[PDB]
C-alpha cells in the first residue's frame, strides 16, 4: 500500500487519476449549483406567478439546500492543479509551462517532440505560424474565431 507495490516509477501519477474524479463531479454538479446560485442571487421578481415574500422564502430555501449539499463540486477550474499524465510534472495554464491541446507539461511536450512520440510541425520560434487567424491578430483573434465557429454562426431558435 505504502511503497510496497506501486508498479509505477512516479507515485504522483495517481493525482491525474483522482483529478479526473473532480472533473466527473463537476459534470455531475454543475447544473444544480448554477441553478441554485442564480435563484438565490436573483433579486427582481422571478415571474408574474411568484413575487415578493414567496420569492424571498424560495431564495432562502434554495440557498439552504445548496449549503446542505455536502460534496457538491463548486470549485473554479483555474484552481485545479494541472499535472501531465506521463511524468507528473505540474504546469500553470496560460504560460509556456503547459500545452493546452496535448494537456502535458512543457518538459513532457519537449521530450515527446525531441523524440518520435508526437506528430507536430516545426515552425519559426519567433513568429505567428501558418494560421491566418494567428497572423491576423494573434491568440485573441484565434480565440474569437473559435468562439464564432462554435456558437456565433447558428440561428439558435
Amino acid at each position: 500500500m505504502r511503497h510496497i507495490g506501486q508498479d509505477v516509477p512516479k507515485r504522483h501519477t495517481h493525482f491525474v487519476l483522482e483529478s479526473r474524479l473532480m472533473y466527473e463531479k463537476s459534470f455531475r454538479d454543475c447544473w444544480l449549483h448554477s441553478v441554485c446560485r442564480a435563484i438565490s442571487q436573483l433579486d427582481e421578481p422571478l415571474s408574474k406567478t411568484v413575487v415578493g415574500t414567496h420569492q424571498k422564502m424560495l431564495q432562502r430555501k434554495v440557498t439552504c439546500f445548496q449549503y446542505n449539499q455536502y460534496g457538491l463540486f463548486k470549485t473554479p477550474y483555474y484552481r485545479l492543479a494541472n499535472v501531465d499524465r506521463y511524468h507528473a510534472v505540474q504546469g500553470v495554464a496560460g504560460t509556456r509551462e503547459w500545452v493546452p491541446y496535448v494537456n502535458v507539461s512543457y518538459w513532457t511536450m519537449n521530450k515527446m517532440v525531441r523524440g518520435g512520440n508526437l506528430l507536430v510541425h516545426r515552425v519559426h520560434y519567433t513568429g505567428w505560424g501558418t494560421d491566418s487567424h494567428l497572423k491576423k491578430g494573434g491568440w485573441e483573434h484565434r480565440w474569437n474565431k473559435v468562439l464564432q465557429r462554435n456558437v456565433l454562426q447558428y440561428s439558435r431558435i
Binding site: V8, P9, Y86, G115, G116, N117, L118, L119
Partner: protein, 356 residues
C-alpha cells in the same frame, strides 16, 4: 525507452518507421479484412433476456364462442402475462359447478388447464381432486388411449413442480415416446421447474430419468436455470445415479458448468436466504461439480504454486550439499546392473563410503 511503453498508434516514429507505412505513400487500404462473414458467432449476452415470458405458457386456444360465453368466469383465470388475485378455491368451485354445462371436451380441458395453472400460481394445497375427477375415466384408468391436449399435461406438470407433488411421475412416464410423446413439446422453463421440484424431493431416480429424457429429447441443457440444475443435482446420494451425473456433466457447456459451480457455492454459502427451502448438505456432488468445472475450464500456469517443492537433481544436490547422493547414484547404477543380466545375481552389496 522508459518504464512507460510507447504508444504504437499515435507515435510518428513507429508509424513512419521501416516496419510501417510512411506518409509519402498512396495511403491505400492494406488488406480487405472480412471476419464476421467468413466465420460469424451467435449472440450470447451474459445478461439474461429482459423480455422473456419468465414462466410456463399454456397456449389458451379456446374457441371464440366459448371464450365469449365463459369470459365472466375466465376473468378470474389468468390471461396473457396477467395474474388476477381471485382465490383458487373460488375458481375450483366455479369449474366443478359449470363443467357439465359446457358440454365440449376441448374447452372443458382448456378451462381445467387454466384452473390448474391458477392453482399452481397460488400454491393451493388441494387441486389433485379435479385431476382425479377428470383424468381416470378418460385417460389413465387402466388402458385408456385417449390422449389429452397439450394444456392439461402442461398445467398438471407445472402444478406438481410448484407444490412438490408426487403425481408428476405418472404423467412424465405417460408422456414418453411410447405413449403420448408430449416430451418434445415441453419448454425449457418447464424442464427447469421440473428439475427444481424433483431436486427438492429426494428423488435421485427421478432426477436421473428426467436428465436422460432431456438428453434424448434435445432439451436446452444450457438455457435451464442454474439454481434449478444445482437443486436437481444435489440429490444424487445413490452411487449409480452419482456415476450417471459424473458422466452426464460433460454434456453441458463450459460457461454453463463454470457458472453452475458459482451457483452451487453461493447457494451453499449466502444463497440459503434466497433459497425457499434450505439446500440439503451433499459435499460429494458439490466437490465433484467444482472438480468438473476446473477440469473443463482452460488451465493457467502458476510455476511457483506448482513447483514450490521441486527437489533438484541428485547430481546438483550432491555437488552443493554434503549428502549421501554421491554414493546413492553408484548404488542405483549397481541396482540397474543387478536387475539386468550384466551383474551376477545372489551377490551382496554393502556400503562403499562412510555414512556422515
Amino acid at each position: 525507452v522508459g518504464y512507460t511503453p510507447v504508444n504504437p498508434d499515435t507515435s510518428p516514429m513507429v508509424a513512419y518507421s521501416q516496419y510501417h507505412w510512411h506518409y509519402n505513400l498512396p495511403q491505400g487500404m492494406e488488406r480487405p479484412h472480412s471476419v464476421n462473414r467468413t466465420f460469424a458467432a451467435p449472440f450470447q449476452s451474459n445478461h439474461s433476456l429482459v423480455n422473456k415470458y419468465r414462466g410456463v405458457w399454456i397456449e389458451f386456444d379456446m374457441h371464440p364462442a366459448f371464450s365469449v360465453a365463459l369470459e365472466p368466469q375466465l376473468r378470474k383465470l389468468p390471461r396473457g402475462r396477467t395474474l388476477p388475485k381471485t382465490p383458487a378455491e373460488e375458481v375450483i368451485a366455479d369449474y366443478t359447478a359449470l363443467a357439465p354445462l359446457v358440454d365440449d371436451e376441448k374447452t372443458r380441458d382448456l378451462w381445467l388447464a387454466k384452473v390448474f395453472q391458477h392453482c399452481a400460481f397460488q400454491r393451493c394445497g388441494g387441486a389433485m381432486e379435479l385431476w382425479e375427477r377428470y383424468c381416470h375415466q378418460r385417460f389413465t384408468a387402466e388402458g385408456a388411449t385417449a390422449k389429452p391436449p397439450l394444456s392439461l399435461v402442461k398445467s398438471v406438470l407445472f402444478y406438481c413442480n410448484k407444490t412438490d407433488n408426487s403425481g408428476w411421475r405418472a404423467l412424465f412416464d405417460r408422456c414418453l415416446k411410447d405413449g403420448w410423446n408430449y416430451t418434445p413439446l415441453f419448454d425449457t422453463a418447464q424442464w427447469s421447474f421440473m428439475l427444481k421440484s424433483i431436486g427438492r424431493m429426494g428423488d435421485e431416480d427421478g432426477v436421473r430419468a428426467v436428465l436422460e429424457e432431456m438428453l434424448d429429447v434435445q432439451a436446452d441443457l444450457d438455457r435451464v436455470e442454474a439454481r434449478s440444475v444445482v437443486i436437481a443435482l444435489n440429490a444424487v446420494t445413490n452411487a449409480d445415479v452419482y456415476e450417471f451425473v459424473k458422466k452426464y456433466l460433460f454434456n453441458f457447456g463450459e460457461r454453463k458448468v463454470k457458472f453452475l459451480r458459482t451457483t452451487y457455492s453461493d447457494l451453499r454459502g449466502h444463497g440459503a436466504g434466497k433459497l425457499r427451502i434450505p439446500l440439503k448438505e451433499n459435499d460429494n456432488m458439490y466437490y465433484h461439480v467444482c472438480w468438473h468445472s476446473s477440469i473443463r475450464s482452460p488451465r493457467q500456469f502458476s510455476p511457483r504454486q506448482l513447483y514450490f517443492d521441486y527437489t533438484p537433481s541428485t547430481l546438483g544436490s550432491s555437488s552443493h550439499n554434503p549428502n549421501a547422493k554421491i554414493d546413492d547414484i553408484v548404488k542405483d547404477k549397481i541396482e540397474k546392473w543387478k536387475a539386468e543380466g550384466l551383474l551376477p545375481e545372489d551377490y551382496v552389496h554393502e556400503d562403499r563410503v562412510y555414512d556422515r
